[PDB]
Design a binder for this molecule. Structure first.
Ligand SMILES: O=C(O)CCC(=O)C(=O)O
Ligand SMILES: O=C(O)CCC(=O)C(=O)O
Ligand SMILES: [Fe+3]
Ligand SMILES: [Fe+3]
Ligand SMILES: [Fe+3]
Ligand SMILES: [Fe+3]
Lengths: 317, 336
């Protein structure tokens, strides 16, 4: 159903060794030299892994893929943290952050948001006690709402990379693609027109902030999507757009799949071909909870220049 | 302008790599070659990779050149009389592969379905029958400076020009934007949507003739530009170090917009007067940032005897997926 790649022990050992070597060689990501070297360093990954990801990227066909069987040394990585703030970067799991950064260079360029997790290029995803009953990344008890990442945003991620340091209770990530066959030729044409408002999140000078846009784009035979139901509205008078939006929602909602990122899995989500979400789970808060790392990938770093403080920064805002 | 000069050791390494890859791969008709390009480019000398990566990330200079490649003249052979009908791959396939590797370090090579048989690597040499045209296979006529496809939302992000030969040292003109010669008020105007940049009709089926529903959709966005004549900016990105898109021939400054006229003239003078002659000599590879520089080519006299100036050209996009609406399939790298 969805292509994936399973590392041999030899590949897993090569990758682990590489990330350890790299971690000892470079300070943190605060080293501009590491960010420079990223694509060259990523060419030291096993060739089969490079070829698989390049095929996924170019095939432009599936909403996600997974590289399975990485060796994520649990003792070295240590206990899942209580919070991301006040925590020292780099931590003992730096090799794994570096792994995801190497992967982000094979896909495009890593970038981040200056006001998010202190502007770290690699984000943490783990249950936080205080942020518990909020439906955000560091939450536990809720979600239920799949999304394109930053659907409102002109420079939103092209891909997301999620590396599962641990997932002992097999908590799924929801991911859903667009099945076009349940959708009429007329509704598709409407969804391609700029007839919808996608509002910004409460996360995030110039803003900017204004127009109305499409939900579907790219090829009409195999469309890309920007879908965030919670933040999306249709002017009341546009009954055709509302009709087509209703049909789109029903098709995407009913096709959502549960994708479990297990320990040693790296999940790649294509932000144009899939929406994703997370499901509620009871956290333990003992230091053994689900811990993912996350890196956002842009195909074209220069396109977001106007929202970046300098030419060199990869942080928007 | 920073440039990189290869040592004889680096040139030899680059040459040997391109000959090895030419031997291992069929042609560019192999989709496996296209998949492998960025990994193959990691086999280039490290100093070259570091240099281009710095150029790309610095986002500061509008061109750069890597000088001193070994382009074996006896192997490459005579400059062709036409691009049409040639046996592929040609004996110059290693130099074509070289540009392709460079293109993978900058982004993705792409082309245009109606240009040079859809080849990803273009030829630039004089064709007798084109002697009187203002185009790449011309000679006698000046090719006036331009951003490549200024009108086009999926225009090249970079251009790569490799000189297989240039015996008379014909310059490629290249010009950047000295921001310090423009008033803050002029800059503000250039950033505003006040200018019309007309689509070059050679990109479009000029025909308002419905050859399939599929084809019409591939050109609808450009057709909308022609139909609606949106006004757009000439400068964009950062106000302090802006990108620009400038093709004077296709640009219309609206008659009544006095301020836009004043701003444009000042911009045109700054760019025109800053133009430089960049000679891409044998074994040079010239890299043009299509957001930070305009380019063109000076008149010259062709001999049509197999000894003429011969460049190869690869256009680069930072985001192949952005142009999906204009490509026949997900897999194809050709717009139109
Ligand atoms: O925790 C997950 O599996 C996904 C969270 C998410 O939506 C995101 O990180 O964008
Ligand atoms: O021949 C040259 O040096 C440049 C011609 C040109 O304008 C181009 O290839 O885009
Ligand atoms: Fe998300
Ligand atoms: Fe966001
Ligand atoms: Fe040109
Ligand atoms: Fe053109």
């Amino acid at each position: 159903s969805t292509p994936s790649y399973s590392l041999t022990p030899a590949e897993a050992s090569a990758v682990a060794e590489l990330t350890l070597e790299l971690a000892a060689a470079y300070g943190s990501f605060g080293d501009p030299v590491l960010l420079r070297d990223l694509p060259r360093l990523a060419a030291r990954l096993p060739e089969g892994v490079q070829d698989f990801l390049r095929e996924f990227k170019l095939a432009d066909r599936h909403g996600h893929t997974v590289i399975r069987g990485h060796d994520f040394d649990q003792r070295r990585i240590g206990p899942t943290p209580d919070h991301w703030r006040g925590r020292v970067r780099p931590g003992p799991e730096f090799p794994e952050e570096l792994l995801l950064m190497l992967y982000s260079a094979l896909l495009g360029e890593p970038f981040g948001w200056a006001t998010q997790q202190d502007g770290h290029l690699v984000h943490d995803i783990f249950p936080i006690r205080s942020h518990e009953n909020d439906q955000l990344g560091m939450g536990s008890k809720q979600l239920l709402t799949w999304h394109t990442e930053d659907a409102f945003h002109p420079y939103r991620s092209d891909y997301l990379i999620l590396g599962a340091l641990r997932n002992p209770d097999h908590v799924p990530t929801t991911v859903g693609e667009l099945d076009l066959s349940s959708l009429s030729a007329e509704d598709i044409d409407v969804l391609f027109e700029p007839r919808y408002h996608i509002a910004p999140d409460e996360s995030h000078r110039m803003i900017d902030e204004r127009p109305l846009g499409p939900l579907l784009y790219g090829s009409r035979l195999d469309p890309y999507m920007r879908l965030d139901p919670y933040f999306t509205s249709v002017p009341q008078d546009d009954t055709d757009a509302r009709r087509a939006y209703d049909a789109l929602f029903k098709v995407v909602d009913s096709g959502m799949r549960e994708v479990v990122a297990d320990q040693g899995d790296v999940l790649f989500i294509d932000n144009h071909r899939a929406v994703h979400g997370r499901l509620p789970f009871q956290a333990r808060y003992d230091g053994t909870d689900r811990w993912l790392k996350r890196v956002c990938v842009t195909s074209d770093l220069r396109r977001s220049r106007e929202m970046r403080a300098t030419s060199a920064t990869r942080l928007l805002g």
